[PDB]
Symmetry: C3
Amino acid sequence: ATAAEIAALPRQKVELVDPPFVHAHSQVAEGGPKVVEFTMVIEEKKIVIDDAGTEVHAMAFNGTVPGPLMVVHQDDYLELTLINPETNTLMHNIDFHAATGALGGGGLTEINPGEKTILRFKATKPGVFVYHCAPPGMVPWHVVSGMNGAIMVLPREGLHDGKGKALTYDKIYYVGEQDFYVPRDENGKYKKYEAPGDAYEDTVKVMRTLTPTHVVFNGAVGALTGDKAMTAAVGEKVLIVHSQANRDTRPHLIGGHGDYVWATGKFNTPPDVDQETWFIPGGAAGAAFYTFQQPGIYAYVNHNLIEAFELGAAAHFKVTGEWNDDLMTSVLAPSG
Amino acid sequence: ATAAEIAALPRQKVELVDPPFVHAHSQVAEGGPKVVEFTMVIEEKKIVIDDAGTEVHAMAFNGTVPGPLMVVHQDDYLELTLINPETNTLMHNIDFHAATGALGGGGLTEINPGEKTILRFKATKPGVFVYHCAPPGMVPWHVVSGMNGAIMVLPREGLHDGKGKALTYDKIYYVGEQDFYVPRDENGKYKKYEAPGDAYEDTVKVMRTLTPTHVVFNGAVGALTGDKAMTAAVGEKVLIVHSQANRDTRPHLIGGHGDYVWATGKFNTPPDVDQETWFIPGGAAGAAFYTFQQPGIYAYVNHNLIEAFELGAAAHFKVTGEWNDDLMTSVLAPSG
Amino acid sequence: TAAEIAALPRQKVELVDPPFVHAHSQVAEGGPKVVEFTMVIEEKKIVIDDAGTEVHAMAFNGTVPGPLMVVHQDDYLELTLINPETNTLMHNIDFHAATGALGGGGLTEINPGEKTILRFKATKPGVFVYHCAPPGMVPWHVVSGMNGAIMVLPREGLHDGKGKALTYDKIYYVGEQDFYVPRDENGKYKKYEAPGDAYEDTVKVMRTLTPTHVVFNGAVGALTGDKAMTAAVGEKVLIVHSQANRDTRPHLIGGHGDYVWATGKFNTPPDVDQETWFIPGGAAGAAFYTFQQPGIYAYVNHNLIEAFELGAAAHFKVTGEWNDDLMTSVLAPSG
Ligand SMILES: O=N[O-]
Ligand SMILES: O=N[O-]
Ligand SMILES: O=N[O-]
Ligand SMILES: [Cu+2]
Ligand SMILES: [Cu+2]
Ligand SMILES: [Cu+2]
Ligand SMILES: [Cu+2]
Ligand SMILES: [Cu+2]
Ligand SMILES: [Cu+2]
């Protein structure tokens, strides 16, 4: 498209919401290509990541870890206003894996505290894609401080299975998985700091072990449980978008499956089916579609079970509805 | 199906066999859906995992690590009687990744020492799938103590390639891969413990390093070598089912290939072909089909070669038959 | 038949050092051939980082990785492998592309002062790892750099999943190496007189499963700066990537993998529109991309600690016209 053609396209302003929720959207595109406008303010802030009060100096798009999910359709333009307030200490930028050119946008969006920028790119490829900050010379430090999220570029006709039949979800959730590398003192207690830069050298030492101290969803151990358990009902179709900007993960719905899984996250690559555990490499997003068939509590985990149940990578679903004894029944309950 | 309909189905009792062997079965289903009955007794038992005499307090379905392979067909019911003898010390349960509801069955099968339970589930999806114990709050400790195996749910019409041509194996082996996390003393020698509980705290410390001390097939370094090497012949079609309940692996047949590999383990997901090294994420099973073409000794490994050759993840095949100089020949033997 | 195999033409090919690739045609020229290559093994000290850190490299053809050999399906690859008398260790070669004798390793064990010639039929199309594998010291040779890859092209060249031809303008081979360099009690990397002197200390590092360095083309920054790979807007590039011991997850920063044979095997349909692909340890993969924007790209293992702390980052320098439709700065960084 020419500059004039793009200038004539309709604009739509979107209001972002905090993960694991996703902002309002339509699965099938409403009308032709649009310039979809988003704004995010970067917040450097302390987050508490476990029940021992361990702290991370988060670098948080829109104030959350992960940053929020942006949803557009293929061949829309995504136009992001990114703001780095004067209250922050570091330069930041943004790299969209969905975008083409200038290091995904990072080369055009380096903003010091007190600066803003507006980047537009054409969403040419359908899928879920990571975005993350990447300041030259400081790239993994910002990413493993939580400065990452994802977008979804839906096909204009919505999702389809590998034989071209529509797949339409009732609910969508976005699970951002984060590896953290928290320094410890000589007695094994996690260290606290009173500015992000003060933690840099100690954190790099831990990073270089390639062994996270914490692996968490939505920024903290237990975050997506209790008050933040995800919900569904028997018969409901749910899309679970999962990202990991730095490190591999292997998602698994305990008690369920991934009926269709775009494990690479790219919708023109046919989905795997009937999955027990899928695999998303560091630096990518993936998506799983499931229809719930049983009520009750489910756990949703990274299925390195040490990562899930020692290091923090476990969420819950609470599902309502009627139990199906054909699918599963206790013929003899635990007894002497 | 209604309760009355399920009650009218034929029952078939199966006698399990120890890995890497697989109990007798038919690739193509014989007759309509059946309730296929299995029994396993859980044994907490000391095992030796290397030639030095290193011990683990294993938690072993049917007394083996891995637990045995159960084989059914799609839309059969798997009915397991699980027994936790009074000689054991811990509560145990079972989660079938093939099943739907109640955390794969774990929520319905929590049995204390001196208890049993019977779980029935409908095997709705074709593939190989992990099963493992998962007591709330103690999940990875049981799994990495060996309390895991796999099942195979064959399509009722047997296996096919991605384009609908039948694939019929001559024999099948089940390789369960186990990551162990054995504590060491200040001399760097592995520790021994009187009861399983005494090892817990020390073992969790090793687990949290995400670095196993041992990575083994069939419960020990070298378990599938010597007189326990797997066997085949030139022309023979072999299915190798491989599981890893906790941690990634990358199987490879040294001197061979995976002609067809269901790397995700799910038979409705078309197999990859001509594979050198395939990838099975922690929490999953996969399956590879190969027709042997050359005689001699092969090694079957996890192709992180440190894991294979330092940590234990290497098996052997002995293969009979005639050497094929078209496929490979030594034109000049090592010489001055 | 025996006479048919003996009657096939034999063709010698001159190798080139990675990341470049020797002369070849994408579509096969003529019928099956026995394609002859020669490599000399070099044991030598290399410096792998900006601090003067040394590895005793074990290098096919003198490079880490060893060079890419290119044949077509149903050709034969006939390698003369030479272990000069100045070396100290026995070596061999395992081709993952080959069938039998542990990929060739069982037939090619050569002591210093020996050579051998191995022929195998390249029956399966794809990119495949090759590596040294002396029994009982396999990972040590591999993680000392003694690995590379081959490409077995389909006789009709590459195609997408719908049978449309994919023809590259250029090809690069990125071999990724995990190194495990011992350190003294003060954290300084150790140096050794002879390769064997480092064996025990190195195995201790290996068993941590944590590399000290993860590099392309044998050193931190080997494919950056003035050694960046190059392309132009509109150019179609195939990037072959291998890792003989350890997983990797390649990513072109600012680009994509338009078609990715992530398993490396061309009869397995390629994934499309990839952000980051995954190659397990012990395998090669290949990605096809048409460049659409000029400028500097990074190409990384997208464990960004591995990329930007441990060494696994390369660059492409791309010429041509910027496309504002694909991306534009609506408002440059400003107050
Ligand atoms: O599926 N239980 O980890
Ligand atoms: O294929 N030898 O690891
Ligand atoms: O795609 N930036 O690592
Ligand atoms: Cu930042
Ligand atoms: Cu990135
Ligand atoms: Cu148990
Ligand atoms: Cu599980
Ligand atoms: Cu060697
Ligand atoms: Cu190998």
